[PDB]
Amino acid sequence: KTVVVTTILESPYVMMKKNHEMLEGNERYEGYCVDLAAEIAKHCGFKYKLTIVGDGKYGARDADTKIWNGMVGELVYGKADIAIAPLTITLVREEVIDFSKPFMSLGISIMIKKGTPIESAEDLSKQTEIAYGTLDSGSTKEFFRRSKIAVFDKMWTYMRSAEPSVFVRTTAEGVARVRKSKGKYAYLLESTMNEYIEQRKPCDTMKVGGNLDSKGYGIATPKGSSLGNAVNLAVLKLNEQGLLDKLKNKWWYDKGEC
Amino acid sequence: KTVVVTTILESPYVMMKKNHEMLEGNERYEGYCVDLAAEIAKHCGFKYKLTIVGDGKYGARDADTKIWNGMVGELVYGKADIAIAPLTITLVREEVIDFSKPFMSLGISIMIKKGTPIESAEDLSKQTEIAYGTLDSGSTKEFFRRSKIAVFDKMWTYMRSAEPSVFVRTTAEGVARVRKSKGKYAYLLESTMNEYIEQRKPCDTMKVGGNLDSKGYGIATPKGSSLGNAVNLAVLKLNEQGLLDKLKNKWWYDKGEC
């Protein structure tokens, strides 16, 4: 009867507390999604267990086997009852799992090491000196793969064939790549994460230009799940009550170090 | 067979063509939602008829009769099969009708006549010289009435008791009131509309401060409607292909006058 929640270690959504080793169960974690999970569980009246997705991925379908990985896969194959994480609502995912209305609004953005001569996606697309990539098994990579927009189509063509690979396994890896590239690598990631990192030491990265698109994160459940309806209404109530905005300020700027 | 679409005459979403009198059916109208309706119908494979909501309202439930008015009412009582308009996804509405994922992201904002000494909601709430209101039967009015947030609570207490009434019947009425008030009336409306009006002559209004909240517009259908699934997937596909961004640029800035 305990709801199995699949989530991912991605700051500031879900992070291990400093003293996590002395703690047990859900108490080991903290963050925006940890707080959200507690609120959702309270309003929907259920007990839960936070579990970190096995493969550390958000979710994409293997082109050859057609098997889903990441948190999406855990929902699709019955390993988890709900995903509470910064998981983007997309067409390909909506076809296999259900999503609540968005609890956060965002868009793809460009992260650069401060000083990098780039101000837009068009800039990145018209040069080669600065390499750029995105997160593997994430919605941004899939967005570029499917976009028929001239600029993004050109960017995808470059990224998919780039050697060495410009893709990374985790957001952390992408950020580290930007910071150690001395400005020779730009990273495409959602504005939420870009803005968070810009507020973290060593304060050497920044979001440049506007967002490339507009999308949202939603709480996901297996298609047809009974929890779906209640969770959706809970998200709408939490947003209207200002709770979601309070959580973003709490985890993004109240704890900012820049 | 033919899907009855309820919508509202709200520029630039739906407007009467200059020569509408000499045109038939759907050809009489133009605008963002007219363009969107054609695309949604094409992608979902259905024929449709655009109809303007009888009472010219978005939708609220009367406190005494418990009867829903506006486009929400048209769906609730079976007068329309779908609503394609700048209709905000809200908890109270989601309890009686279904909504697709957002096709537009926005938030409540403040419109002032240029020169008005107001920079935020906090400013409005602490003074009385400048009156302020919002749209009747709209989601913004409902937001303020249900808000437990100190500042918004104070603002509702004022608006609810202000005499003469600070509420208006249509967005156009609110804008006209701001323009003829010599700066003594501020208007609370969604950022989308605020931004649009900011681009229309005589270019005497502007949006000030940040948005008060974060929400979205969704395509609505009667609760449990069979059209729901297809329409939602169509919205996601159209957003991912940049169609929604193209439509906003088309109707907001390409046709801008300021």
Ligand SMILES: Cc1onc(C(=O)O)c1C[C@H](N)C(=O)O
């Ligand atoms: C977080 C996060 O931050 N940036 C990304 C990205 O895919 O660029 C993601 C993953 C994405 N929300 C998804 O694949 O659901």
Ligand SMILES: Cc1onc(C(=O)O)c1C[C@H](N)C(=O)O
């Ligand atoms: C448009 C529009 O622009 N501003 C508003 C508002 O309620 O402030 C609205 C109506 C609202 N989207 C709704 O009640 O659905």
Ligand SMILES: [Zn+2]
């Ligand atoms: Zn709560």
Ligand SMILES: [Zn+2]
């Ligand atoms: Zn006319």
Ligand SMILES: [Zn+2]
């Ligand atoms: Zn199309």
Ligand SMILES: [Zn+2]
């Ligand atoms: Zn066609």
